[PDB]
Nucleic acid binder design. Structure first.
Lengths: 52, 52
RNA sequence: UUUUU
RNA sequence: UUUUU
């Protein structure tokens, strides 16, 4: 006996009724936390400084 | 200029969002600010959006 | 979010 | 409504 975390009967928004929006294939998405923030800048900027 | 019945602003009031997205892009690359605030001393680099 | 000499 | 170089 085993199972998964995410579910489908959960209370979730619905454009229309049958649709479930937060598609439950997102099991694999956990990049670095700080890497996503705004407090750190972007890779492009980091490049253009390094080139200028 | 001599060939519009109301003024020049009253015709160019259309072209709003095009240059808006323009400055969004080319500011996202680099720290652009326009002229009109630099004479009037804006402070925030973010608020280039409406220094028209 | 900025503002720490 | 106009008047912002």
């Amino acid at each position: 006996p085993r199972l998964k975390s995410l579910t489908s009967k959960m209370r979730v928004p619905r454009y229309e009724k049958r649709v479930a929006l937060n598609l439950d294939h997102l099991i694999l998405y956990t990049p670095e936390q700080t890497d996503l923030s705004n407090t750190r800048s972007t890779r492009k900027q980091f490049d253009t400084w390094f080139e200028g | 200029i001599d060939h519009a019945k109301p003024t020049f602003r009253q015709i160019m009031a259309h072209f709003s969002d095009v240059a808006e997205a323009y400055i969004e892009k080319r500011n996202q690359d680099r720290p652009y600010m326009p002229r009109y605030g630099l004479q009037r001393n804006l402070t925030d680099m973010s608020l280039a959006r409406y220094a028209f």
